[PDB]
From Swiss-Prot:
Family: Belongs to the alpha-carbonic anhydrase family.
Outcome of substituting residue 115 to Q: Strongly reduced activity and sulfonamide affinity
Cellular compartment(s): Cytoplasm; Cell membrane
Function noted in UniProt: Catalyzes the reversible hydration of carbon dioxide. Can also hydrate cyanamide to urea. Stimulates the chloride-bicarbonate exchange activity of SLC26A6. Essential for bone resorption and osteoclast differentiation. Involved in the regulation of fluid secretion into the anterior chamber of the eye. Contributes to intracellular pH regulation in the duodenal upper villous epithelium during proton-coupled peptide absorption.
Misc. comment: Target of drugs used in treatments against glaucoma disorder and breast cancer.
Protein name: Carbonic anhydrase 2
Catalytic activity reported: hydrogencarbonate + H(+) = CO2 + H2O; urea = cyanamide + H2O
Residues recorded as bearing Phosphoserine in the entry: 163, 170
Record note on what altering residue 92 to C/D/E/N/Q does: Strongly reduced CO(2) hydrase and p-nitrophenyl acetate esterase activities, impaired stability of zinc binding
Result for mutant: residue 65 to H: Enhanced proton transfer
UniProt note: pH dependence: Optimum pH is 6-8.
Effect of residue 196 to S/V: Reduced activity
Length: 258
């Protein structure tokens, strides 16, 4: 009886194994666009992904992770609200059963069809495992997906999902360029929060881009053919793997833009 997204093991249950689920800096949150404060002192965000080395794609039973070689400063996030250098370790998505839901963050209570999380760890802590124990350990770049035109830079991800249908399957996934997943604008909201899955550690500077990317109905349909279950278990479609909005409590969302 492990955590999941079902009636018996979903987000309303997580607090029993992970009591920080009811903590002071949980994620995601609703972004109230009229309450977020423009902070003219935020530096421009620096996304340096030209030397990014993708290695592998994994179905972990909750999502799929596209994993990167994080053994050198090859794909880094810097600037914006961040002090120092954060190394890209993986990206994943959260998505719905229907185009009307799927994102974790909301914007004036609007739910997008999906949300991309590019996960980076603070190099001052040496590895990801130590970084997640620090209040400034991670920087997650959050990008909303809406359904419309195809995102060409996503198709290589969509085409390998057949090969990782069930929990614990992986596949070689070299030479994937995550720059093909970014929108034009790097305008963002930022606030201190958490992982959105167990163990829900309060180690994340969230950087949520204002501009969504467009993906095709056919692209998100392929996300929804994945399985939470392992091979030769009853089929449970990997859908609605999103945590809903948590209490803002004593936190200020800042906007990089007027
Ligand atoms: O869901 N998830 C899992 C790992 C991680 F580092 C960040 C997030 S958002
Ligand atoms: Zn996530």
């Amino acid at each position: 009886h492990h955590w999941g997204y079902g009636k018996h093991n979903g987000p309303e249950h997580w607090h029993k194994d992970f009591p920080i689920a009811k903590g002071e800096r949980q994620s995601p949150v609703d972004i109230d666009t009229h309450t977020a404060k423009y902070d003219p002192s935020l530096k421009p965000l620096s996304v340096s992904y030209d030397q990014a080395t993708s290695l592998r794609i994994l179905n972990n039973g909750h999502a799929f992770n596209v994993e990167f070689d994080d053994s050198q400063d090859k794909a880094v996030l810097k600037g914006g609200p961040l002090d120092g250098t954060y190394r890209l370790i993986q990206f994943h998505f959260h998505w719905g059963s229907l185009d009307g839901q799927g994102s974790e963050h909301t914007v004036d209570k609007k739910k997008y069809a999906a949300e991309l999380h590019l996960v980076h760890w603070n190099t001052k802590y040496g590895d990801f495992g130590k970084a997640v124990q620090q209040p400034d350990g991670l920087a997650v770049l959050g990008i909303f997906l809406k359904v419309g035109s195809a995102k060409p830079g996503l198709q290589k991800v969509v085409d390998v999902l057949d090969s990782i249908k069930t929990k614990g399957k992986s596949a070689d996934f070299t030479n994937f360029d995550p720059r093909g997943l970014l929108p034009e604008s790097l305008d963002y909201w930022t606030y201190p929060g958490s992982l959105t899955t167990p163990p829900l550690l309060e180690c994340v500077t969230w950087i949520v881009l204002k501009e969504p990317i467009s993906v095709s109905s056919e692209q998100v349909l392929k996300f929804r053919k994945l399985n939470f279950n392992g091979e030769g278990e009853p089929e449970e479609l990997m859908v609605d793997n999103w945590r809903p909005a948590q209490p803002l409590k004593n936190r200020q969302i800042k906007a990089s833009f007027k």
